[PDB]
Design a protein around this nucleic acid. Structure first.
Ligand code: MG
Ligand code: MG
Ligand code: MG
Ligand code: MG
Lengths: 80, 52, 95, 146, 111, 49, 354, 41
RNA sequence: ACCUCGGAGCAGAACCCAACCUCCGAGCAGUACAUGCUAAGACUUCACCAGUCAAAGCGAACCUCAAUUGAUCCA
């Protein structure tokens, strides 16, 4: 549960919730899954390092969507 | 009439490519991709290996 | 080759085969392509990469090299950091 | 046991039927090949301009041959404001009107396949400038082959 | 005597490797040719020895289509621009009709 | 392999296990003449160890 | 052995006797126009069009729309010729055309385009977007009433919904503002449906709005038989299509078997098939307008999915079919080591019985 | 020490490099200019 | 006299096809300097060796030609 995560500070608990919404369930839990090895010890290591990199990074196709959004503005220019 | 010539990178990498030039031409200087610096750098002719 | 030596009465290896080829434990033989360090200024880059590949051998050539080497060269070898440790076995191979 | 909602019944495969779907996602095939003839058919949409003796027609066409959006001087729409229907002004104004129709149809990218004399003509330069400054990008994004 | 020498080259083993209606995978050579006998059509790439390969997985289909050359192939435009009016040249093109959908939309979560 | 040997009682876990206990319990065969330098412990079966 | 041709040969009716007294094409362009005309000709040989084109039925797509507006061609043509005469009589117009400094007013152009050929251009856009195929199963109607739809975004902003432009669910959270130019005494029906968007049935759509028995342009006094639910395209499902349909009613219609509940947030009740709708009520009204937009996933959709529809948010991903890789051989004769890596399953070391 | 010396020599060469590029390129464009001069003759 | 390589006929239409059979050529030249790297799938001169084409990807940009050639060891 990212909200009740006292081991994470609040400034960064909130940046993670806006940076990893695609990984937050409706129960407010951050979910991490690793399947790149046949040893659950190595998969758990990958998941824990993913959490650690989330905290560190919080502490510190795009061309298509950019042009589509820009042309969405040349039409939403409809002022009243 | 033509010659094979070793061209050595001036990036200090030690990369070396071999190409051909007419003998009655001057020493070749080229822009070639050195993959050690991952960039297109100057190469200058440092030896004649044979006649092709 | 020598099928029975004169000092030990045993079969001998062809050290030419040993100095040229690599045997994987699965029974496959690996070689380099002929002319990979020759006249490269006339070779195109696709051909040069093709020559730089490590390629396998025939069934006929494999049986021939297995006959020209002794059973010491077919044992399983547990080297420290062998780059062919993956290829020493077959996976998902049907018939 | 937890009673399931009669709403959360989703099929294991979504079936989007929008013709534009995989093309706006960049994951759709472009018709490669035809590399001994002209024009190329490796595009999703294309701008094709037809300059007849009297009129100028510009169309945005799918690779199917289906025509998406079009602008011609044969319309009274463009006729009642132009002096002439075959001038550099005609090509420019058709460029502006189709650019507007493309933006409202959602067509933001297309291929333009010119001929060298069309490319070096000044009517087509004013049309491409009109489309580019009206919002239409005249190079299509590449396919995410993987 | 016999002052004719050479001529001892073997056959190139060229021609069609995948006839009509055969299933083909991406990369498979459909034909090999010294001259452009069969032309690249839909989803069929051409390699620099004029060889024809399948760009998509599908079914090889031969057709006869019209021939409009690139307006930079000086040789072919010169013929087209001397051709009589009402005359459309045709050639034999090879097409791969692709067999599988580019992909499917599957459920991956229930977030 | 180590867990299987321990469970079948061929290697005593209550004593320090060394190469001698692993060749006496006959879980590894070492050939110093084939340039064997001993035993390497590998990760297989770390999840049920 | 030879077989005679099954029909006319292509370059057959060209007289090969007077080849030097026959006219030639001296232009790549002129050859190209003839080439493409033959290319679109039917032809009795095997064709790219035969193997790749869409072979729809020649059922001659049935019109289901309000009759075409009647105009007087002679008076219209006379007015247009006189107007062009005045425009060319202006000297400054000729100056601007020769100096290439002229311009054309896009707003006026768009207004009378909406009046003149906009209906047919919209019909072609709908057919390209496949809305008739999926709403009316092939039947086509010329949109003869301009249905202006916009979304109130910000305080002074509107995002219009023309003919397939993208509108985000953040911009489509609340109901749109609609305007159809009508006369008094004409009852109407406005409908919003998401064609692509049903999460269970692949054939069905989702009803979003069913304003019925509507006074006239007045869009606030029509029975709200189904309330606006904002579009909800799932994440990774791609671009969905959402169509606002406007039908002109003759008699006042009783909509009691198509009356969705009040705070209706159940998708099994929000399933809709416009073919069944228009079939059961065909003899009462006729389609008149069509405004459509394209919708993708946005953060607001997590809200619609979680709070409004009491459900977990569906997430989908495009998966591409796996690679071919022919049957593996015991002796892969001239292949590299990457072969054995192609048939390998796991990248980590295995040890077998050791 | 050998690795540091190699990387530092590479660093000095790549530090001097862009200026080398611009004046070699001006010599090349210049060589085009004399070539066009003797082809104007 | 010939011995290796390529094009045409014999060998008319998938492939292949011999003669001290009939003809013609090759043992390069030009350009480039990403003529970088890598990697699915294929072709194949009737074996092997050798030879050929190539999607996707990384990095950049925004090859002509028909043959035009020589293994291993060793230097
Ligand atoms: Mg011959
Ligand atoms: Mg022969
Ligand atoms: Mg073969
Ligand atoms: Mg590529």
């Amino acid at each position: 549960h990212l909200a009740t995560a006292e081991w994470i500070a609040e400034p960064v608990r909130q940046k993670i919730a806006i940076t990893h919404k695609n990984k937050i369930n409706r129960l407010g839990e951050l979910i991490l899954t690793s399947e790149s090895s046949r040893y659950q010890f190595r998969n758990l290591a990958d998941c824990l390092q993913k959490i650690r990199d989330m905290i560190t990074e919080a502490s510190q196709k795009l061309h298509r969507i950019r042009i589509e959004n820009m042309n969405r503005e040349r039409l939403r220019q409809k002022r009243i | 009439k033509n010659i094979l010539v070793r061209m050595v990178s001036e990036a200090g990498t030690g990369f070396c490519f071999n190409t051909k030039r007419n003998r009655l031409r001057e020493k070749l200087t080229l822009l070639h991709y050195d993959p050690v610096v991952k960039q297109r750098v100057l190469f200058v002719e440092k030896k004649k290996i044979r006649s092709l | 080759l020598t099928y029975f030596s004169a000092r030990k009465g045993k079969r001998k290896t062809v050290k030419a085969v040993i100095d040229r080829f690599l045997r994987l434990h699965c029974g496959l033989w690996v070689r380099r392509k002929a002319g990979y360090k020759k006249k490269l200024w006339k070779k195109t880059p696709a051909r040069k990469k093709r020559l730089r590949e490590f390629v396998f051998c025939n069934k006929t050539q494999s049986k021939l090299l297995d006959k020209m080497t002794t059973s010491f060269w077919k044992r399983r070898n547990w080297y420290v950091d062998d780059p062919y440790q993956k290829y020493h076995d077959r996976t998902n191979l049907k018939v | 046991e937890v009673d399931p909602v009669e709403n959360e019944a989703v099929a294991p495969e979504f079936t989007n039927r929008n013709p534009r779907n995989l093309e706006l996602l960049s994951v759709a095939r472009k018709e490669r090949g035809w590399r001994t003839v002209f024009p190329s058919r490796e595009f999703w949409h294309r701008l094709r301009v037809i300059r007849t003796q009297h009129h100028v027609e510009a169309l945005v066409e799918h690779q199917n041959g289906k025509v998406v959006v079009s602008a011609s001087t044969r319309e009274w729409a463009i006729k009642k404001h132009l002096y002439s229907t075959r001038n550099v002004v005609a090509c420019e104004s058709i460029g502006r009107v189709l650019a507007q129709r493309c933006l409202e149809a959602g067509i933001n990218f297309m291929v333009y396949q010119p001929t060298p004399w069309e490319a070096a003509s000044d009517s087509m330069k004013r049309l491409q400038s009109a489309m580019t400054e009206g919002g239409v990008v005249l190079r299509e994004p590449q396919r995410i082959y993987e | 005597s016999s002052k004719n020498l050479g001529g001892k080259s073997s056959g190139r083993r060229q021609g069609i490797k995948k006839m009509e209606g055969h299933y083909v995978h991406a990369g498979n050579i459909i034909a090999t040719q010294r001259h452009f006998r069969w032309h690249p059509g839909a989803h069929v790439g051409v390699g620099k020895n004029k060889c024809l390969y399948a760009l998509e997985e599908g079914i090889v289909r031969y057709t006869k289509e019209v021939y409009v050359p690139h307006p930079r192939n000086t040789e072919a435009v010169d013929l087209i621009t001397r051709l009589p009016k009402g005359a459309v040249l045709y050639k034999t093109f090879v097409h791969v009709v692709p067999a599988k959908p580019e992909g499917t939309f599957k459920l991956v979560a229930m977030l | 392999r180590l867990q299987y040997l321990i469970d079948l009682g061929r290697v005593d876990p209550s004593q320090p296990i060394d190469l001698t206990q692993l060749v006496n319990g006959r879980g590894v065969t070492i050939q110093p003449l084939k340039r064997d330098y001993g035993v390497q412990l590998v990760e297989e079966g770390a999840d049920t160890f | 052995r030879r077989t005679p041709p099954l029909g006319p040969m292509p370059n057959s009716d060209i007289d090969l006797s007077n080849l030097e007294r026959l006219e030639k094409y001296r232009s790549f362009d002129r050859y190209r126009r003839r080439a493409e005309q033959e290319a679109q000709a039917p032809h009795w040989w095997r064709t790219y069009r035969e193997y790749f084109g869409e072979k729809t039925d020649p059922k001659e797509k049935i019109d289901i729309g309000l009759p075409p507006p009647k105009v007087s061609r002679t008076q219209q043509l006379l007015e247009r010729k006189q107007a062009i005469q005045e425009l060319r009589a202006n000297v400054e117009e000729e100056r601007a055309a020769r100096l290439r400094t002229a311009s054309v007013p896009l707003d006026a152009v768009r207004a009378e385009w909406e009046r003149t050929c906009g209906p047919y251009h919209k019909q072609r856009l709908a057919e390209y977007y496949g809305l008739y195929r999926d709403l009316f199963h092939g039947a086509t109607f010329v949109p003869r009433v301009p249905l202006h739809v916009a979304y109130a975004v910000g305080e002074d902003d509107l995002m219009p919904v023309y003919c397939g432009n993208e509108v985000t669910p953040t911009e489509a959270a609340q109901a749109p503002e609609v305007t159809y130019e009508a006369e008094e005494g004409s009852l109407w029906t406005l409908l919003l449906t998401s064609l692509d968007g049903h999460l269970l049935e692949p054939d069905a759509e989702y009803l979003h709005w069913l304003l019925t028995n509507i006074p006239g342009n007045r869009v606030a006094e029509g029975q709200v038989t189904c309330p606006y639910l904002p579009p909800f395209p799932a994440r990774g499902s791609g671009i969905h299509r959402l169509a606002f349909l406007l039908f002109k009613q003759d008699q006042p219609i009783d909509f009691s078997e198509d009356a969705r509940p009040s705070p209706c947030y159940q998708l099994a009740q929000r399933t809709f098939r416009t073919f069944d709708f228009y079939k059961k009520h065909q003899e009462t009204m006729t389609p008149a307008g069509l405004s459509f937009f394209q919708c993708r996933w946005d953060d607001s959709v997590t809200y619609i999915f979680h709070q409004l529809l009491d459900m977990r948010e569906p997430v989908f991903e495009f998966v591409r079919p796996p690679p071919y890789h022919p049957k593996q051989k015991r002796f892969p004769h001239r292949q590299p080591l990457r072969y054995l890596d192609r048939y390998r399953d796991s990248h980590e070391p295995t040890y077998g019985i050791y | 020490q050998k690795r540091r010396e190699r990387e530092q020599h590479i660093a000095e060469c790549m530090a001097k490099m862009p200026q080398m590029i611009v004046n070699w390129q001006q010599q090349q464009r210049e060589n085009w200019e004399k070539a066009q001069a003797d082809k104007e003759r």
